[PDB]
């Protein structure tokens, strides 16, 4: 039975969520409905779910979302990663900060200070996503191309996020 | 099938128990009834159950409650925790004591004497709550269970150490979808 | 050769340090001098040495002390303690916070400002009971890791050390022990 | 026999190097001379040595330095660090970026580059931090550093430490 | 399926056996009947069963009892307990005897030699419970507090009938 | 080099201490002096040393004693004993209580046993320490050394302790 | 399913075999009959079966008995017993002979005393065989001899009252 | 350096002790004297030393003997012997008693026959103790009893001719 | 399900094959027919089957026989036997040679032993195969089954083979 | 230092012992003298030494011999040989006896019962050599060819004196 | 100290042995003399030594040679080689047989009969040489020794499988620098 770990970008990037509906809230609702009738487990890291809720107001959808998408933390005890992964994470932080810095009087340096604090949060989400995907042996669904490139050098299973609805449909119990 | 370890706050904090009914005994009895018809195991550490019985008089409910919610002790023999966990526990005691000390101070010859006994009850309960926290975490770890809490402090420790969690406000909803 | 882990109390409790000299700074300086000519390794946890520097001002003694007493952190990686040590610590915490409350109140057994001064002396008591509990863990873990003899003076810590199988000495005989190991 | 892993700050922060000489190039030279007669091993990560050379021109000292201080890379092959360490590293990056900008903030076109530079050096110094810790862990060595934030981290992880102000002193008490 | 290890106290302390019947022999008889029709294994240490028979005369009930409640010895070969457990046992002996002599008011020499027999029962009970991963059913506060320190599964003995019924 | 774990009865039973001197305090003092020159390690469990101090007032000898005979606790962390040893302990408690009860039979019944428990806890501490250090158990108590024999702990005649100490410089 | 290892005494001591029938060969035949319709495995050591056959003639029953009661040797190849067990066996030899010696006390006196201890060691070798086989198969020892059952208990072998063997077999069909 | 485990028979059988001196207590004293100046460790099981003391009074010599010959118990805690060894011990009991029984054949007849087999099992328990201790220390067994030495050989314990013990000790000073 | 390793003597000793039929070839044929319907695996070592074919001419029965009783070699690669078994083998050779020598004593001395060696090699092949498969050894030879007993291999009375086969559909 | 395991053939076959002396008792005597002054351990299996004493009467040489040549049994507990070795032993027995009867020309029954005694010696020799990691000294072609198949260290027995001398 | 395993070709190929002297027996005896005063162990497989004795009559030299060059058999009991090695051996037999077949052909009613016996001696020696090669490699591996050969074919197999090598022409020089 296929397990998936979802990124923040799955429901915040329009290129991905448009497959459910053009509205954000409507796409999320459609996803939740479909997730009930599909033979799949969905997961999302605690940290990622937190940032998703800061961006999108789910309200009455939250409990249904939390029922179909299990929110687990990847911080297992005694989990060890090889030293190499540590060094690759450093490169991911570089990517994240510099990407945020590109998109940025003194609203250029409280923009800039906000960009790097977001860049750290995005990196701590990336590692949470990968670790959880690794632990569950799950398929990582993510609109962030930079994350997906890293999930490959590390050998995590992937899907084209644009085909998530399609995949889900062809697995209905 | 899903396993849950319940904290004391599941049935003592109104924000959580109101999903079952509006009376404490009503909520407990509604929970027990539903637990019978749900495909799930429930557990509560011995220490947590003890404090729960001091705060609430179950009476005739106790045997039914003890049947649906299994009371186990998490004090395993060959169990080992990393030295990290030990240091994290010290921070939880700090959190517990200082939160309990805030609430003593705020309520605030004769006024000096009610304040000393109010600060002793703040610390002693702060330690009791910290020992319960550990019991809850260890049991959750051992059974690979979903910790149902409500005490934001505990839930955030549970998260640091990778224990499974749920929003306690959605407990009834989850139970209803596992019948 | 013998290895020792030192508590704060070895140089702050007068019943212990008098063996070197009657003054505090004099006792510490005398200890350092003797430690140089003794065939023994001395250690103190980073957390404990920090509290020792907050209570006593070593000044020019610091570098000599830091040479004879090695200041190491016991927070090794993958160190695992059994789960019973977790519960025994919960109990030391209790003993500690309580001993302190005792002195807070018992010291304050003694306008309305009285209430605020009592409020502080209670606050200070728990904050220092948690600092002394963290010290206690640090001391035991360091003693365990090095297989060292714990020199304390604190009854509460030594009782715990004994429960967990850590080697102990009478702190009052430290100078004597050191003298019978000269190189 | 004692082993030490040196940080850049040992020879770039004056508060540390003054124990050898007031002069930077003289402190380094004095250190090198003493290291020859000291019963100790010295090490410095490859990345750390690279940054040290970009700040200080050693010239004819380089070969003597490279003989007394062995320049090794900690990027071993089967090394596994706990997942926790990974999260600790993220916090170290936060500390170093935020320390860099606090410096930057104080001194429009010059500001955008003073802020790029703040965080590119912030990442480089975080990579140096990891290199230093991993090498210290691998060799079971005593980490000598002037940076507070690195020395604070070397404690959470249990790496052996020294007051850098006492380095000369320690070296002298080992022949 | 839930396994259980029974103490002597289950059928000798009236507070516990009254749930089956007011009569002692009738409670045992009722328990055995119910045990047949419940999806649960029952066990009792050799040493505990011996003392139970010295106190209660079962007569024709014995073979039915021995069929529903399996009598095993916990003395498996190569079983190792942590040194800590050994020290905790010493404390249990202290508890057992001190209680016993309170009760003295030749009756000192019986309060000792019974206090140790009760201690040997306690160990046999805990070890068997540990080995089978069973739920310890016991009236005795002291045994149940020790069982808890060592992480053995417990039940309120007063709800034994109720639990059996719901299986 | 030879390691020894000492019981309480080494310095509290006259049959054993007479080899050092006729006086108790003098035998202890003679032992301490001889221990300093001897090529052997001496040890005594914490619990055993405590009871020894309650019986004998060492005074100024305590620091010299605590230098020659090292007072360790045998309650090591990951230590496991076979379940059989646990059952052997129960028999030792019976031996100790019944011996203490015979002598009582002339509050002296209540403390005939409370001492019997303390003596049994000491016995365990002595055996475990002996096991851990792979040491020779020196004890005058018959019952303890007969147990020590069942569990394969090395033994000596306590009456020959001085002689053995002398044959090791 | 339950497994049992049988002693000689289960069919030679009258106090146990009377549960099947009053006559010895009749009891054996009833047992065999019942064992066929029982949901249980029966075993007896080779050495024990040999002495059983030297005491009872059996004849016609032998092939039926050998079908229901499997005769195995417990001398497994890599079996290790604790040194302790070795000492315990010396005590069992003592018990076995000194018993034998009580009967004898009731030339021929020598010829009775020699015969007493030679049968004593044969019975000791039976005891070992029985315990080892019970251990190997994790079987319930059905004996009748108190001394063997006391030993079996110290060693933690599963036991039953031999007087209830028929009853147990009946409740497993 | 060479290690030896001694039997009772090394100082109770005259055929062996005569190499030291004709008198028993004189031989023991010479052995003790020589053992002091020998580069070799000597050992004897607790059970063996006990029976040795019940046969020879010794007295004055005891502390010197206990210094040169270390009296250890071989009942080590985690010792495992193969099941095979257990069977071999049953044969040793047989040998030991049937021998004992030959002497007896030469009331009192009973009191001689009881005494014969009680000493036989005591000697069997000695044999085990000796072999186990020899095994544990990797020591050379010095016996005098042929039956024990035959066993020691089947088990692969190191052996010496007891008649050459003095000679061996002399060539190690 | 039950597995059996068969010796040569199962079909070459009349005391054993008479249960199937009075004729040799008829007993073998009856056995093969019964084996097909029985819920049991049969095996015979390669070496044993070779000698069986030299003694009895199976003709058209061979393919049916080789279908019901599987002919395997027990010379597995990483197989190790304890050194004791090696010494036990030496005693088996002595038994086999001396038995063959008694019967010889009436080139019949030279081949009294050469057969004794072949029979000893067969014995080893039989035991090793039985050990490997955890099979029940069926053999009429007294000496072999008494060895099989010493080494803990499962056994049956060969006289009851038909009866056992019948009680397994 | 080089350890050696000696066969009977070392002191019973004249081709080998002639290097010490022409006389048999003198060769043994000479060997023992040299053995004392050479930096090498010597060993011989129990079974081999027994047969050696049945053939040669040593008398007063025995204790000196037993001091220089340690007589151990190879029957260590738990030693395992590969199944292959077992089959190779069968072949050795075949070799030993077949040789033996050639020689027959009651003398058939002795050529067998000696052929097996020689086989049991062969195993004892190889196992001891294996256990000690020793050099096997043997006159017998057949034993030395087997020793070679199993990877045991060998020497030419004719050069034994020479090797001892250079140590 | 350095250990060496010698091939048959060390003393039979002149290009190698000429470093010691110009006569075969001269070279062997010079080698033996030097081997006595060098801090090095020498070994040769039993099979290799056998073939060496067939080709050269050592006589009185044999005991001295056997003392300096230890003749061991590499047929270890628990020794395992990777299945690669097995396939590589087949290629070595191909090399050996085809090299030996070339030399038979080249030398080349009566001519047919000397050619059949010349092709049988080419194969049978080709197998003998292949078994020697394996013995040499296995012994070298077991002792972690330096293979001294000269047979270019063997040296190139030895290299594929990571055995230590030396130029055989420098053997004397190496021995001289280890005195």
Author numbering:
A (entry chain B): 1 to 104, 123 to 191
B (entry chain D), K (entry chain D): 1 to 108, 120 to 190
C (entry chain C): 1 to 110, 119 to 191
D (entry chain A): 1 to 107, 123 to 190
E (entry chain F), J (entry chain F): 1 to 105, 128 to 189
F (entry chain E), I (entry chain E): 1 to 106, 128 to 190
G (entry chain G), H (entry chain G): 1 to 106, 124 to 190
Copy the relevant paper text.
One of the first steps of tRNA processing in nearly every organism is the removal of the 5′ leader sequence by ribonuclease P (RNase P). In contrast to other RNase Ps, HARPs consist only of a metallonuclease domain and lack the canonical substrate recognition domain essential in other classes of proteinaceous RNase P. We determined the cryo-EM structure of Aquifex aeolicus HARP (Aq880) and two crystal structures of Hydrogenobacter thermophilus HARP (Hth1307) to reveal that both enzymes form large ring-like assemblies: a dodecamer in Aq880 and a tetradecamer in Hth1307. HARP structures in additional oligomeric states have also been published, including HARP dimers from Planctomyces bacterium and Thermococcus celer and a HARP tetramer from P. bacterium complexed with Escherichia coli pre-tRNAHis. These data all show that a monomer of HARP is a VapC-like endonuclease that consists of a PIN domain-like metallonuclease domain and two protruding α helices, which are thought to be responsible for substrate recognition. The active site is conserved among HARPs and PRORPs, with five negatively charged residues, predominantly aspartate, positioned to coordinate two catalytic magnesium ions.
Molecular replacement revealed a heptamer in the asymmetric unit that, upon generation of its symmetry mate, produces a tetradecamer (14-mer) flat cylindrical ring consisting of a radial arrangement of seven HARP dimers. The structure was solved to 3.2 Å resolution. Notably, the dimer and tetramer interfaces of the 14-mer are fairly similar when compared to our Hth1307 tetramer structure. The angles between dimers in the 14-mer structure range from 48° to 54°, and the distances between the proposed tRNA elbow binding region and the active site ranges from 39.4 to 42.1 Å. Despite the additional dimer compared to the dodecamers, the Hth1307 tetradecamer maintains a roughly 42 Å distance from the active site to the proposed binding site. The tetradecamer presented here is the largest oligomeric HARP assembly to be described so far. Strikingly, unlike all of the dodecameric structures, our tetradecameric structure has no helical features and is instead a flat ring with nearly identical tetramer interfaces throughout. Experiments using His-tagged Hth1307 revealed a single oligomeric state of a tetradecamer (14-mer). The ability of Hth1307 to form a 14-mer in vitro was confirmed using native MS experiments, providing evidence that a 14-mer structure is not an artifact of our crystallization conditions.
